A paper describes a structure:
The crystal structure of YfiR was determined to 2.40 Å resolution and reveals two molecules in an asymmetric unit, with each molecule traced in continuous electron density from Arg38 at the N-terminus to Thr189 at the C-terminus. Each YfiR monomer consists of a twisted, seven-stranded β-sheet flanked on one side by the N- and C-terminal helices (α1 and α4 respectively), and on the other by the helices α2 and α3. The mixed, seven-stranded β-sheet has a β2-β3-β1-β4-β5-β6-β7 topology. Analytical ultracentrifugation analysis confirms that YfiR forms a dimer in solution, which is consistent with a recent YfiR crystal structure. The two-fold symmetrical dimer is formed by several key interactions, including salt-bridges by Asp80 and Arg98 and main chain hydrogen bonding between Thr76 of each monomer. YfiR crystallizes as a dimer and features two pairs of conserved cysteine residues; Cys71-Cys110 are in a reduced state while Cys145-Cys152 form a disulfide bond. Two highly conserved pairs of cysteine residues were identified in the structure, Cys71-Cys110 and Cys145-Cys152, with only the latter pair confirmed to form a disulfide bond from the electron density. Mapping the conservation scores for each amino acid onto the YfiR structure reveals a large, continuous, highly conserved region on the surface of the protein formed by the C-terminal helices α3, α4 and the α3-α4 loop, with contributions from strand β7, the N-terminal helix α1 and the α1-β1 loop. The structure of P. aeruginosa YfiR was determined by single-wavelength anomalous dispersion from a Se-Met derivative protein using the AutoSol module in PHENIX with 2.25 Å data collected at the peak wavelength.
The tripartite signalling system YfiBNR in P. aeruginosa modulates intracellular c-di-GMP levels in response to signals received in the periplasm and is a key regulator of the SCV phenotype. The effector protein YfiN (also known as TpbB or PA1120) is an integral inner membrane protein that functions as a diguanylate cyclase, consisting of a periplasmic PAS domain, a cytoplasmic HAMP domain and a catalytic GGDEF domain. The third component of the YfiBNR signalling system, YfiR, has a key role in the signal transduction process by bridging YfiN in the inner membrane and YfiB in the outer membrane. YfiB can release the repression of YfiN by sequestering YfiR at the outer membrane, which requires both membrane anchoring and peptidoglycan binding by YfiB for full activity.
Numbering used by the authors: 39 to 189
The structure:
Amino acid sequence: TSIEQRSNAVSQVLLGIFSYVRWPKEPAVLQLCVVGPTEYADGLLRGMVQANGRRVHAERRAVDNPDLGTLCNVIYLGVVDERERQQVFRSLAGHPVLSISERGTECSVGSMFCLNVGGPRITFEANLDSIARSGVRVHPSVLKLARRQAT
């Protein structure tokens, strides 16, 4: 599976996940921030559209932007260090933000979902603590998407 192939797939898995999530004040345009170095975010940085027609606007922002929490609805988190990671999740505390990381190491440190972009399919894990404190509602059937992503 090539990088273009995986990036495209990451896009559709992210749409999949978004469809199980609700924000307390649903915006007309869903804002996505890509934070830190990423390999697979070029597809989602094109912008996306959800099944109901709501647009997902994407852009990159710096790790140390203190207003990440009010600047977006969704965070796609790349490869950052301990300090940077702390920085980011302290910015998000108390705000209704969905967090997904590109690598599956981050479910232990604050990300709600962590992708494993490797093998034949994009799979992901989730973290209940981070989900519970996130300020958004995640429907538990989101794990249907994950389960089906093996085989």
